[model samples]
Target chain A: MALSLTADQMVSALLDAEPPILYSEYPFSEASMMGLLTNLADRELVHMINWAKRVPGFVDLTLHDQVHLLESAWLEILMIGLVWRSMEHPGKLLFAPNLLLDRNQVEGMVEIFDMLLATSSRFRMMNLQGEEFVCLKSIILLNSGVYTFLSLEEKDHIHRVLDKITDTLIHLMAKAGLTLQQQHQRLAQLLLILSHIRHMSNKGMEHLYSMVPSYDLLLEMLDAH
Target chain B: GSHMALSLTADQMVSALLDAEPPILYSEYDPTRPFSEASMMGLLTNLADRELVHMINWAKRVPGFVDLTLHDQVHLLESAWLEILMIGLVWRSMEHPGKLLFAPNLLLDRNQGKSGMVEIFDMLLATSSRFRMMNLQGEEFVCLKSIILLNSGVEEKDHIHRVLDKITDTLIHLMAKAGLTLQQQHQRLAQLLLILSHIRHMSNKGMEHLYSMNVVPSYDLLLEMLDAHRLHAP
Candidate 1:
C-alpha cells in the first residue's frame, strides 16, 4: 500500500507544472526594476506553492512540516529557475521573458550581479539539459527541508523520497552515455550547485527584507527567514 | 602641452575635493536617552541638516560647480541632497559589516530603530555591501560624490554638463595614477556610474519613508530640502 507517487511521475509532473513566464510591465527604473523582481517573486511563489502540493510524497508529510520546507527554500527555488532561464544568455539575466538585465542595470546589487552571472556560466559549462534542470530543482527543494524538525517517521520518508529522485537523476545521466566515473563526477557537480543556490537565496532574502510583497505565501516564507 | 597641466590639475582637484568633505560625527546623539521614533528622526534630521551645509560648501569648491549660475547650483543641490546623503551613508557603513555607521557616534544595529527605520537600515546595508565588495577607496568616493552632484541637474546647461565631463576626466586620471590598466579603469568607471541609479532610488525611498513617519520632528532644513526637490521633480 505505497502512498508516494513514483519518482518518475514526480519529475514528469514537476516539468509539466512549471510557472508561466511573464514580462515586466514597465521599462527599467530604479523603482520599476525592484517592482518587476518583486512581482515575479510573488508570481513564482504562487505557482511553486501549488506545485509543491503535488510533488509525489510531499503531501504525505504533516502540514506544519510541509510549510516549513516550502517556506525555507522558496527563494532558492526562484533563483534556480532564474539560473535555468538565463543559462543560454550569459551576457544578461532574462529576468522576464521580455526583460533582460545586463551588468550595468544589475550593478547596484554588486554581489548578486556577480553570483548570478557566474552561476549561469557554470550551468552553461555543464551543458545542463532540461531533464537535469528539473531534477536539480526538485532535489534542492527537498534537500532544503532536511534540517527541519520533522517527525522521525516523516524524516525517514523524506530521505527515501529524495533517494528515489536522486537515483532517477543518476539514471538519466547514465543514459546519456557517460562512464561510471563521469556519472559520479557530474552528480557531485550538480549537488555543488546547490551550495551556490543556498548563498544566492540568503542574499535574495536580505535584499527583499526592505521591499517584501504582500502575498500570503511570500510573507509566510520570508518571515520564516 | 596643456594636457600635462590639466593632468596635474586633476590630481590636485581630486586631493582638494576629498579634503572638502566634512568630518561629521553626531556628537549630540545621546544613546543613553530613551529611544523614541521622534528622537531618532530628530537626530537623523539634525545630522542631515548639518551635512547639508557642508555639502553646499563642498559643492562650491568642486572645480567648476560654483561657476555655474546660482540657480543651477541651487537646483542641482536640491535635486541631489538626499542622494548625496545616501552616498555618505553607504561610505560610512562600508567598514562595518552588519551595522550602519550612520555617524561615527551614531552606529545603528538592525533592531535599534523603528518605524520604517529598520527597513531603511536594511537598504543602506544592501548598498554598503556593494561598496564593500568593490573595495571603494577615498579617491573613488570623492570622484563619485562630485560626479553625482554635477549629474543630477535637469537642465541641459552646457557648462554644468562640461563640469561633469571634467570630473569624469579627473576620475580617469586618478585611476590611471593608481596604475590600473585601461580595462580596469573602464570597468571601475562603469560600475561607479551605475551606482548612481541605486543612490537615486534610495533617495526617493528615504524621502518617502520620512514623509510617512507619524512623528514629525523639527526637520527644518531637511524638510525644506525635501520640499524643494519634490516640487522641482514634478
Candidate 2:
C-alpha cells in the first residue's frame, strides 16, 4: 500500500467523497446546489492552510502577512485546484462522481460557471504535470500582492520563494524531456493561466462572499465599501 | 491626428500624460512623528482638491478627449475621479511605508482609535506599496493610468473602447521592448489590472469610511462627483 502522499494525492485527498448519484436532470434543487457547493468549498480553506504549512518557505511569512495572504489567495487556490482536476472531465463538473453539472445547467451560478468553462477549456491545453499543479497551488497561495504591509524584506523573501518554485517547475519540465524552447512556452502558459485565475479570484470572492458571508477577509477587502 | 500618434512610441504617449501631472512624493508627515487628527483631515481635503484639478487637467489633455461633448467629458471625469485620485495617492505614498502622504505637507498614521478608519489609511498604504513593487516606469504608469480612465464598466461608446485598446496595444509593445518574455508580460499586465481593481476597492472603502464620519466638503464633493459621473449611463 502506498503510504506517502504525492502532490496529486494531496489534491485527491481534498476531494470531497464522491457523492451519491442524484438524478441527472434539470431543476436540480437549490437544496442540492447548496450541498454540493458547501461540500466543494468546505475543506478548501482548511486544505489551503495545510497546503501552505507544507510548502518550504510559507511558514516564514509574518503571522499578519500569512493571514492576509491566505485570506486574499485561498479562493484562487481552490479555483485552480478545480481547474487542474477538471482536465480529464471536460464540460461536465463533478461535485461527486455522478453528481455532476452540465455546462448548460448553470442556474444559480453566474460567476462560477463562466470560470468553469473558461478555465476547464484552457486546462486541457497545458498538458499539466503533477509537479506543475503543486507549484501552481503553492504560488497562488503565497502571492504577496495582497499585502503591501509586508516589509520589503518579507516581500523579497516571498519573491525568492516564488523564484525557487518556478525554477523547480522548470526542472520538472526538463526532467520530463522538454526542450529549452518548450520549457519557456510551458512557463508562459502557466503564468497566463495564473493571471486568469488571479483575475477570477478577485471577481469570484466578491460573489462568493455574498453567497457565504462567513469570510471576514472578503468583507474587509471587498464589501468594505 | 493618427499620423502624430503613429510617430510617437507607446512610452512617449504615456510620458506625455505623466509630464502633465507628475506625482508629488512625500513632502510632509513623518512615520517617526505624531500627527493631528484634525491636521490629517485638513491634509486630505487640500490634497483631494489639488488632485481633482490635476486629474481633470490630465483627462483634458488625453488626445481627442477634449473633442468629446463637455457633458461626456465630465461624465468620464466624475466616474473615474476616485480611481484617478487613488492612482496618484499610490504613486506618492510608494516610497513611504507606515505613513502615507495625504498631501505634500501632510503624512498620515491616524490613531482612528476614535473612529478607527485607520484601517482605511492602512489600506491606502498597502496599495501604494504594491504599485511601488510593480516598479513601473513613468510611461508604464501613464499607460496604466490611461486605461483606468477608460474603464466605466458600462457599455462605453465605440470611440472610447477604440482609444482604450490603442493605448493597451502600445503598452503591450512597450512591455515586450522592456524584455519581458511573453509570459512575464501576461503576468505583469494582469497584475497591473488587478492593482487597478485594488485602487477602486480601496477608494470606495476609504470614501465610505470618510463619509460615515461626515468629513463635510470632502465627502460631499466625492458623492456629488460620483453622482455627476453616473450621468453617462449607457
Candidate 3:
C-alpha cells in the first residue's frame, strides 16, 4: 500500500513539470516523428535534445554527443507516452478518434506487437503514475543508445543524472510502502517497456525509410553523420 | 481499418495500383528494390501504362463508371490518366520532402545535377509539400485521385459527368471526418481541386511535348508506353 502511494506520488510530481516542446505541431501527441524531426532547425534541436530544456550539464557536451542521443532516445520516449492511453482501451490504440489502430495494421509488425501488448498489460496492472513515468523517461533518455558514442566524462555525467532521478524515485517508492527489492522489480519492469519500444523503433524506422524516406532535415543528415 | 488485426497490413498496400493475392509490393510480382534512375523510370513508364488498366477496374467501383459505353469509359480515362498518375507521384512524395521516392532506392531530388526537368520537378515538389502540410492520409489520397479520374473535362453533361459530383461529395465526407478544422476542410478540398486543375495542365504539356514535337525527353518511355497501351481495355 505504501509502495502504491510512493509510485503515485512520484509520478504525479514529475508530470507536473513543464511540458516538452516539439518542433512541429503534432495533431495528437502522436505526430509522425519523421515530420517533427524534419521541422527542427539547428538551435531548436538543442532544446529537445536536452529534454525540452537545459539538462544542467548536457549543454556542455560536444555537438555530436547531443545529436546522437536524440536519434536514439526520441522514439523510445514517445512510444511509452502513447501506450499510456492504450492501457484502458487495450483493444485499439487510438492516437486520435480517426487514427485508430489495432494490433494487426502493420505489415511485418505482428510478432513485435505481441511483446508490446504484454508490456502495456503489465503497465496497466501496475497502475503507475506520472512521477515514476517522468523519472523513468529521464533515466531512459540518459542511458539510451548514444552512450557508446559519448566520451568518458560525458558518460559519467549522464550516469550521475540517472542516479539523481533514481534517488527521488527511491524516496517515492518507500513512501508508497514498496520494499527495496520491490522498487528494483518495479524499475526493472518499467525498463522492459523501454526495451520493447527500442525494438519497435528499430523496425518502425526500417519500414518507414524503405517505403517513405523523404524528410526535411533530419534523416539524410543523420545518415551522413 | 482492419476488422481482424494483422490483416490490414497487406490488405491496404497500393490497392489503387495493382490487383494481386496476399503480400505483393507495387505489382503482382515480387517487389524489387530499384537500383538506378533509369530502372525506376522504366518501372514508372510501365506502371503508367498498367495504371490505366487498373484505373478502368477502379473506375468501375465509382458506382456508374463501368456501366457506361466502352467509348465513354475510354474517353474519361484517357484525359484523366495523366492526372491520376500525377496524384500517385504526389502521394509517394508525401513522407519525403527534399526528394520524391519513386522507388525504394530511386530518388528525384531537387539538389541534383543539371537537368531540363527541374522546373517541372520543382512545381511537383511544391504540390507534394502542400499535400503533406495538409496532413492528408492514404485513404483521402485515394478518394482525391478517384475524384479527379471521374471528372469529365471533355464530354457532354450526362451520367458520366453527373457521377463526378457524387464521387467528389464522398471526398467532402471524408474530409469532414479527417480531424481538420472546418476551415482546413474547405481549404483542403478546394486546394486539392485546384491542384487537380494543374494535373490536367501538366498532362497536356507532357503529351504535347511527346507527340507534337516528335522528340524524346526523360518521359520518352512513358510516352512509348502510352502509345502502346492507351485505349487498351483490360
DockQ values, each candidate: 0.03, 0.10, 0.01
Model 3: runs farther than 4 Å from truth? A1-225, B1-44, B111-116, B179-184, B212-234
User: In order, how many clashes per candidate?
Assistant: 0, 1, 13
Compose the digit string of candidate 2's lDDT tens values, residues B1-234: 443433456666766666766456333345666654345555566666766644655676675565567667655565567767777767767787766666656655544322445666776777776777778666777776776666532233546645655565566677889998755654565556546655655655554555566343443554455445446434
For residues A126-169, write the lDDT of model 3, one tens digit per residue: 78776676776665555554323522666656644545555566
Q: Point out where model 2 deviates above 4 Å.
A: A1-26, A45-56, A59-68, A82-137, A144-154, A164-225, B3-8, B19-83, B95-97, B112-116, B129-137, B147-234
RMSD of 1: 15.4
Which residue pairs clash in candidate 1? none
Tens-place lDDT per residue, model 1, B104-185, is 7778777776546676677677778768977888888987787667765224454554555556667767778888774455
lDDT winner: 1
lDDT of model 1 at residue A89?
95
For residue B106, what is the lDDT in candidate 2?
A: 63
Query: Per-residue lDDT tens digits of candidate 1, residues A1-225?
Result: 123555466557768866677676644677778778778777677678766765667777766677777776787788888888999998789989778898778433767867888888878878998888887777666666454342267766775666666666667777899864455445544654565666566566666663433345544653343
Question: What are the lDDT scores of the predictions, listed in order?
Answer: 0.67, 0.60, 0.52
Best by TM-score: 2
Higher-ranked by lDDT: 1 or 3 = 1
In angstroms, give how far residue B133 of model 1 lies from its true place: 1.5
Superposition TM-score, candidate 3 onto the true structure: 0.39
